[PDB]
Amino acid sequence: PISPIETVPVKLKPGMDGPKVKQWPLTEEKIKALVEICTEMEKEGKISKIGPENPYNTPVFAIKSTKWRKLVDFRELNKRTQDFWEVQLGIPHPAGIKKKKSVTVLDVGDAYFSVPLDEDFRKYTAFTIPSINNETPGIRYQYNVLPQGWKGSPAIFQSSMTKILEPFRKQNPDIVIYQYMDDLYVGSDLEIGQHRTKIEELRQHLLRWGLTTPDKKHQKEPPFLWMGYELHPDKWTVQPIVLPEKDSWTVNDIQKLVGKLNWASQIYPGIKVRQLCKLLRGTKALTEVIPLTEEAELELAENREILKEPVHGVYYDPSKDLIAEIQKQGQGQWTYQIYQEPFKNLKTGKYARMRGAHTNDVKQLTEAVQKITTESIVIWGKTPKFKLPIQKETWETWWTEYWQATWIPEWEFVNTPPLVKLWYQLEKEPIVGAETFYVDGAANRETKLGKAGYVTNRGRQKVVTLTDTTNQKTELQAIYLALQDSGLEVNIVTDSQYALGIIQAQPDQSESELVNQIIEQLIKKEKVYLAWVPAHK
Amino acid sequence: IETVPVKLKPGMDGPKVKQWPLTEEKIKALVEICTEMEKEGKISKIGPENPYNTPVFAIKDSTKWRKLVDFRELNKRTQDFWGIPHPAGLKKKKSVTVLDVGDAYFSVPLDEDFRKYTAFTIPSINNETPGIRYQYNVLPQGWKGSPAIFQSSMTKILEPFRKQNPDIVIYQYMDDLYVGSDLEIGQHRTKIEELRQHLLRWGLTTELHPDKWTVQPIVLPEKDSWTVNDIQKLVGKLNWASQIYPGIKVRQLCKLLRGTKALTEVIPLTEEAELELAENREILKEPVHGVYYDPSKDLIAEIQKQGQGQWTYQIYQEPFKNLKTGKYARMRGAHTNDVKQLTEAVQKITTESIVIWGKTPKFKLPIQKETWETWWTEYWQATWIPEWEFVNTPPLVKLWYQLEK
Numbered sequence: 019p020i021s022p023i024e025t026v027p028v029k030l031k032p033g034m035d036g037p038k039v040k041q042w043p044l045t046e047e048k049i050k051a052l053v054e055i056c057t058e059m060e061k062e063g064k065i066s067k068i069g070p071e072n073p074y075n076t077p078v079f080a081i082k083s084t085k086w087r088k089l090v091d092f093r094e095l096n097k098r099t100q101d102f103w104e105v106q107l108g109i110p111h112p113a114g115i116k117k118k119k120s121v122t123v124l125d126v127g128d129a130y131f132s133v134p135l136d137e138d139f140r141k142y143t144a145f146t147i148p149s150i151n152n153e154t155p156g157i158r159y160q161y162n163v164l165p166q167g168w169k170g171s172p173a174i175f176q177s178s179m180t181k182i183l184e185p186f187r188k189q190n191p192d193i194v195i196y197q198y199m200d201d202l203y204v205g206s207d208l209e210i211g212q213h214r215t216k217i218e219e220l221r222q223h224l225l226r227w228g229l230t231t232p233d234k235k236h237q238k239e240p241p242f243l244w245m246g247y248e249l250h251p252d253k254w255t256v257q258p259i260v261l262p263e264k265d266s267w268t269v270n271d272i273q274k275l276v277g278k279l280n281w282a283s284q285i286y287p288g289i290k291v292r293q294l295c296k297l298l299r300g301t302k303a304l305t306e307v308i309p310l311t312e313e314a315e316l317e318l319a320e321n322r323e324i325l326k327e328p329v330h331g332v333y334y335d336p337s338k339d340l341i342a343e344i345q346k347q348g349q350g351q352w353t354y355q356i357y358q359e360p361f362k363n364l365k366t367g368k369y370a371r372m373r374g375a376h377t378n379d380v381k382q383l384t385e386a387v388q389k390i391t392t393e394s395i396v397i398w399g400k401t402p403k404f405k406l407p408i409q410k411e412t413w414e415t416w417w418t419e420y421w422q423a424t425w426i427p428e429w430e431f432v433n434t435p436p437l438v439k440l441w442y443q444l445e446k447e448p449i450v451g452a453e454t455f456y457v458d459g460a461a462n463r464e465t466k467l468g469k470a471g472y473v474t475n476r477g478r479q480k481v482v483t484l485t486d487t488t489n490q491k492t493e494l495q496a497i498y499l500a501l502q503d504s505g506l507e508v509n510i511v512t513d514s515q516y517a518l519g520i521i522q523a524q525p526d527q528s529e530s531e532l533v534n535q536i537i538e539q540l541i542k543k544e545k546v547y548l549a550w551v552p553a554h555k
Numbered sequence: 556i557e558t559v560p561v562k563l564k565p566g567m568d569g570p571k572v573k574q575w576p577l578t579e580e581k582i583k584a585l586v587e588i589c590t591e592m593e594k595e596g597k598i599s600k601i602g603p604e605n606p607y608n609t610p611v612f613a614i615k616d617s618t619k620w621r622k623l624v625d626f627r628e629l630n631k632r633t634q635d636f637w638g639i640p641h642p643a644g645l646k647k648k649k650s651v652t653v654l655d656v657g658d659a660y661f662s663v664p665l666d667e668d669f670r671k672y673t674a675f676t677i678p679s680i681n682n683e684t685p686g687i688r689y690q691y692n693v694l695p696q697g698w699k700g701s702p703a704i705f706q707s708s709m710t711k712i713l714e715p716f717r718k719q720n721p722d723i724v725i726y727q728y729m730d731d732l733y734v735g736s737d738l739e740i741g742q743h744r745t746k747i748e749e750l751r752q753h754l755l756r757w758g759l760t761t762e763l764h765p766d767k768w769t770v771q772p773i774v775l776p777e778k779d780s781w782t783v784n785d786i787q788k789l790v791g792k793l794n795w796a797s798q799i800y801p802g803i804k805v806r807q808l809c810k811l812l813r814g815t816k817a818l819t820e821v822i823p824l825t826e827e828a829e830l831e832l833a834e835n836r837e838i839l840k841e842p843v844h845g846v847y848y849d850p851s852k853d854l855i856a857e858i859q860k861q862g863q864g865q866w867t868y869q870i871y872q873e874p875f876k877n878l879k880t881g882k883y884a885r886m887r888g889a890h891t892n893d894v895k896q897l898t899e900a901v902q903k904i905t906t907e908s909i910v911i912w913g914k915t916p917k918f919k920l921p922i923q924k925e926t927w928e929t930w931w932t933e934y935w936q937a938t939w940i941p942e943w944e945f946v947n948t949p950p951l952v953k954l955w956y957q958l959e960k
């Protein structure tokens with residue numbers, strides 16, 4: 019049952035020594051039950067009774083099958099053990115799996131215990147079974163195999179598994195074998211009887227190296243319930259999500275509900291959480307009870323219906339095109355679907371409102387395209403052909419003259435409104451015939467009062483005093499007044515370094531209420547020229 | 556041969572850089588290349604007890620693929636070996652050619668104790684499978700420790716061609732060889748084959764003109780008539796240039812901006828303004844005095860996107876004290892790809908720093924980290940990789956440099 023597998027040389031961190039924590043005394047029941055277990059493990063050759071020598075020790079507990087089960091707390095040993103190669107944390111996504119005629123899932127039962135431990139490291143895992151009467155030595159043992167709960171086990175087991183499969187893979191190039199934790203998902207396009215024959219081959223090749231396994235009956239059958247999905251042979255779906263139903267909701271209830279709903283937004287279209295989120299305002303405690311408003315009730319009622327919709331996915335065919343289409347659902351919010359053929363989605367998603375100090379729709383679209391691209395390369399090792407809701411000229415007009423390097427892989431236009439456009443464009447030259455506003459702003463950053471105003475060539479002037487304001491705000495408010503009091507065409511002279519920023523970027527969305535006001539006003543004008551000039555005399 | 560012990564710098568641990576995702580085609584090429592190297596004993600597979608890692612990727616020329624390892628982190632953590640100096644002549648030559656000699660390294664064993672630090676990972680698609688781990692048994696390409704440890708062997712193999720050609724100069728950096736002469740193109744090129752065939756004789760391989768890299772002059776605009784707007788824009792740039800040249804004045808021009816005149820109105824330049832504009836032009840005819848290169852300082856390279864495919868840049872150590880400045884233009888077939896143009900500029904500029912000072916500068920790139928990291932490899936071709944950071948170009952610096960001649 020143990021394996022002929024070579025052991026992996028393991029070491030303790032630089033400097034420190036093995037653990038030496040004392041054994042937490044236990045009742046006579048829990049002891050006798052441990053003796054039972056540890057005696058059987060000695061039979062299997064998993065642990066070895068030791069003596070005096072070993073200075074180290076780790077606590078052993080007893081928990082409850084309705085019987086007793088051994089538990090060893092390696093927290094300490096672990097923090098003294100070397101670092102291993104990170105076990106992968108990426109989970110395959112069904113949208114990137116290739117459909118197979120047959121699939122057999124095999125889980126390596128007693129994974130860990132079935133692999134030998136580095137002989138030079140065993141002494142560090144010594145533990146002691148107490149005794150009813152104290153003062154009596156107690157049973158001493160150490161591990162001959164990968165301990166369950168020890169820092170190195172997952173990595174060492176995975177590595178072993180990999181080494182054992184390399185030969186089989188080389189002999190069966192057409193067969194695909196997924197490795198995930200201690201689970202193998204095996205698939206082929208062979209005829210069912212052949213497949214079943216090759217599987218039994220694999221099973222016996224594993225048994226050969228000590229890894230036991232599930233045969234045909236004591237197993238798992240499709241659809242497979244894996245990581246929240248339901249995989250069928252012709253497609254996949256997501257396990258239905260259930261939203262509780264109560265007459266009394268606490269703050270915690272609302273936060274969990276909001277979370278599940280937020281997640282469900284990737285898959286389902288019209289999921290909304292606005293009115294439900296409004297419920298958290300000024301909350302004083304997790305257990306606090308917040309009555310639901312009408313809106314929140316309607317919102318919730320509407321979401322329950324949406325979640326009862328049959329959303330299904332399809333698997334990947336490496337012979338057809340990979341295509342992604344994007345939509346602007348709202349300012350800063352995008353939805354996308356990646357597919358191979360019309361209406362058969364491989365996957366869908368949604369990027370929440372990416373707000374900030376200032377950007378423009380064309381920019382955000384760019385970032386959505388890059389996130390989807392990084393995502394596509396991970397899933398399918400390939401970049402999709404994009405279908406973007408933006409005129410080729412808008413793109414060419416933006417990127418052409420943007421101060422930042424930017425790019426979109428091979429794409430195509432698709433007139434599926436609303437389209438992404440440039441909301442306004444500063445003139446490249448002063449406007450002949452349009453009034454010229456000379457604006458300035460300054461204020462006591464200490465008193466937070468101060469003022470900003472303008473004076474034009476046509477004689478128009480004004481000044482406003484601002485209570486509780488700032489420097490950049492007076493500059494900006496200055497520009498704001500000019501835009502407000504001027505006609506459909508204007509020239510504006512400012513010494514503000516910030517406006518200079520607006521010239522180089524020309525944003526359309528922002529955190530600042532002021533900038534927003536300015537943007538609204540800039541979009542209104544038919545022509546606007548903004549000029550910057552050094553400040554001092 | 557034998558292996559010379561090698562250590563990291565005091566208190567430094569080994570690199571643990573995450574491997575970025577790769578396209579199916581690059582993975583297949585890397586699997587092919589690595590299965591071959593493994594067969595020849597250059598690299599071996601490794602166990603989970605090795606936690607280190609350096610990222611790897613695949614670049615081109617036409618048919619086959621070349622493997623590129625980014626040992627930038629390992630290099631920093633790698634001890635110092637104070638390689639050869641820097642021939643002040645190489646930069647003064649007339650024509651230099653670059654040769655890839657990374658193959659030379661595969662013949663020398665790497666100290667077994669150091670091997671683990673060179674671990675790398677070939678990723679899989681969709682997480683279907685754990686990566687394929689390897690480490691080097693021999694001097695790897697791209698690690699600063701290789702050229703150094705092979706120095707004694709390289710001098711020994713270059714001596715004959717060197718004694719033969721007292722004039723020509725050879726300078727080594729990483730995996731490349733920079734050879735320069737004053738000869739005639741024809742004799743130059745054919746004189747390279749002579750060297751290559753000599754290298755071929757051991758195992759190594761199977762146009763730059765330094766006398767043109769000259770700091771560029773900033774020329775001010777010239778106009779028949781000057782509008783208020785015209786004068787404001789001229790005054791803004793001069794105001795900035797003053798940070799470089801203190802003698803620039805704007806009092807006279809600025810006096811022409813009193814009042815509240817329409818931006819389009821024409822203003823007559825007084826005689827004073829005339830002179831002031833002339834003194835400033837005179838000052839600008841030459842690079843500012845006093846700039847010299849300091850070897851105890853980092854070299855810095857900044858780039859601004861001018862538009863229409865043009866890219867300006869400056870190399871310096873201290874602000875406003877440029878060692879070199881230039882303009883790189885978009886070339887045939889990039890008319891829709893900023894990324895490809897920036898990568899071409901970085902390499903071209905990094906190459907220049909190597910020839911002149913024997914080191915690579917630290918770059919300030921006007922692009923977003925995500926955009927850069929997702930595509931820079933698609934167009935890289937150097938055996939080396941410079942250091943870099945992402946910035947937000949100030950509107951003025953840009954405006955002033957597009958004023959170049």
Ligand SMILES: CCC(=O)NS(=O)(=O)c1ccc(NC(=O)COc2ccc(Cl)cc2C(=O)c2cc(Cl)cc(C#N)c2)c(C)c1
Nearest residue numbers: 116117118119120121194203204205240242244249250251
């Ligand atoms: C009644 C007909 C029938 O069900 N036929 S079948 O042999 O059972 C069969 C054949 C293929 C498939 N699946 C596919 O075509 C596409 O899926 C796959 C394609 C190749 C491989 Cl190796 C596994 C799967 C999985 O279904 C799978 C993947 C992962 Cl990461 C975990 C689990 C997990 N856990 C299962 C299924 C679900 C069942």
